[PDB]
Amino acid sequence: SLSNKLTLDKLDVKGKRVVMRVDFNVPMKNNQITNNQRIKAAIPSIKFCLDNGAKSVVLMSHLGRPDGIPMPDKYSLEPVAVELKSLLGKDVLFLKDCVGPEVEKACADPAAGSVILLENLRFHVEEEGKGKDASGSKVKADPAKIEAFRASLSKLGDVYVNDAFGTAHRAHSSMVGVNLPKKAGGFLMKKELNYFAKALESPERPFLAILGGAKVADKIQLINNMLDKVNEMIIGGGMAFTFLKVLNNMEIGTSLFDEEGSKIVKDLMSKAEKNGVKITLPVDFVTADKFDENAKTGQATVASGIPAGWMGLDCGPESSKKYSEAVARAKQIVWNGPVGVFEWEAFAQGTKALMDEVVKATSRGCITIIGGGDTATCCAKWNTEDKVSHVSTGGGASLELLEGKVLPGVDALSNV
Ligand SMILES: Nc1ncnc2c1ncn2[C@@H]1O[C@H](COP(=O)(O)OP(=O)(O)OP(=O)(O)O)[C@@H](O)[C@H]1O
Numbered sequence: 001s002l003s004n005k006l007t008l009d010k011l012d013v014k015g016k017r018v019v020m021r022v023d024f025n026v027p028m029k030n031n032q033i034t035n036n037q038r039i040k041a042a043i044p045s046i047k048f049c050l051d052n053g054a055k056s057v058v059l060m061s062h063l064g065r066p067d068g069i070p071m072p073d074k075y076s077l078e079p080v081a082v083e084l085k086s087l088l089g090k091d092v093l094f095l096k097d098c099v100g101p102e103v104e105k106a107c108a109d110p111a112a113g114s115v116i117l118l119e120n121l122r123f124h125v126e127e128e129g130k131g132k133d134a135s136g137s138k139v140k141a142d143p144a145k146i147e148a149f150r151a152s153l154s155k156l157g158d159v160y161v162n163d164a165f166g167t168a169h170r171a172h173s174s175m176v177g178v179n180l181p182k183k184a185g186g187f188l189m190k191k192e193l194n195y196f197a198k199a200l201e202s203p204e205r206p207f208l209a210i211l212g213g214a215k216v217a218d219k220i221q222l223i224n225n226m227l228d229k230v231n232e233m234i235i236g237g238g239m240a241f242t243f244l245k246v247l248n249n250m251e252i253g254t255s256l257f258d259e260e261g262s263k264i265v266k267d268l269m270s271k272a273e274k275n276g277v278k279i280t281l282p283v284d285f286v287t288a289d290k291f292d293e294n295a296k297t298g299q300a301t302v303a304s305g306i307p308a309g310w311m312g313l314d315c316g317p318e319s320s321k322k323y324s325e326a327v328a329r330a331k332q333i334v335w336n337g338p339v340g341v342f343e344w345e346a347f348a349q350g351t352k353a354l355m356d357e358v359v360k361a362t363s364r365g366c367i368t369i370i371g372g373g374d375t376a377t378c379c380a381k382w383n384t385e386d387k388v389s390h391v392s393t394g395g396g397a398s399l400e401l402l403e404g405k406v407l408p409g410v411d412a413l414s415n416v
């Protein structure tokens with residue numbers, strides 16, 4: 001089904017005005033972009049249009065959290081228009097707004113081959129459907145305003161293209177409110193749909209899921225859904241201490257413990273068993289006397305237990321050995337969440353070693369998929385983004401898909 005959605009390559013842009021939703025939510029150290037990766041990732045879709053005859057390409061995105069109020073001094077997309085021109089090697093007309101008669105006029109019949117970038121969509125409360133006033137109060141959008149906001153956006157072009165997977169899990173105007181005949185996913189969206197269709201529809205075997213992170217209670221449905229698709233599962237990160245404490249009665253000191261999740265642990269292992277899923281848990285760890293980068297370090301195993309006032313921040317060598325064996329047997333892998341506190345070098349090794357194994361697995365034909373967020377951040381930090389099959393551009397959106405939910409933005413796209 002995820003494979004039945006219209007994509008840019010199967011769309012005729014020749015001589016048509018293109019309205020395209022992109023992800024330009026780049027990090028800014030102030031008024032300077034600290035990372036332009038998101039802008040670069042979007043170029044292939046924009047260039048495809050320009051090279052295939054499109055009359056124009058109207059770009060709309062959001063940045064930061066203006067919360068439905070205009071804040072051009074902090075979250076304006078003006079800096080992005082400048083970075084865009086240098087990357088595309090073409091001129092970019094930047095408009096101070098994204099809707100209105102003045103914007104609609106400038107988009108009615110643009111100079112052929114024109115690239116237009118609209119101002120932050122979230123300056124208007126109608127994009128998210130909700131926001132906050134300067135008083136800090138919470139305000140809800142007016143349905144009549146929402147309708148006019150959506151009809152406006154719909155006049156800026158002839159065909160709609162969505163390349164912002166990271167926002168697909170939200171029913172925002174720019175995601176589900178553009179009323180045009182054909183709505184196709186861009187090339188970035190295409191990659192996300194193809195790879196996750198592999199994770200949820202027709203996966204290769206064995207299929208291994210590597211789950212990490214801090215909490216358990218918030219990943220219950222994710223684990224539940226994955227247990228219905230995988231053959232093996234690694235449960236790492238701070239999440240594993242809740243499992244180890246419950247199943248082995250292991251002493252975990254000050255390590256993270258998920259009270260609510262602890263009551264569901266045995267029920268998750270039961271389903272695993274009923275499905276024939278093999279679960280791999282850590283067996284040793286790297287401990288710390290405090291939750292800090294420069295903390296004193298130690299070691300522990302499941303048998304020895306973790307000392308009082310100490311916490312496990314990473315898996316140890318024996319756990320890395322077992323993890324690597326799991327990866328060795330997999331023909332398909334989906335990795336979501338670090339297996340340790342990767343933000344601090346002293347506790348990032350378990351995760352770095354696993355990445356090295358997954359990169360090696362990819363070389364021999366394993367399909368390796370990394371989820372958005374932290375995991376996706378690990379790839380940029382150690383330059384392996386091009387060493388795996390796919391690195392998701394959307395953390396939360398990718399998480400909702402793995403949970404088995406239908407994404408509003410993906411659903412709005414045209415079929416076949
Ligand atoms: N053993 C551990 N003890 C404590 N924290 C850990 C441990 N292993 C990993 N973490 C932390 O878990 C975090 C990732 O958790 P998770 O995947 O739940 O995060 P997220 O939902 O994407 O974001 P947030 O952390 O903001 O909720 C990382 O920042 C990492 O440092």
Ligand SMILES: [Mg+2]
Pocket residue numbers: none
């Ligand atoms: Mg979170």
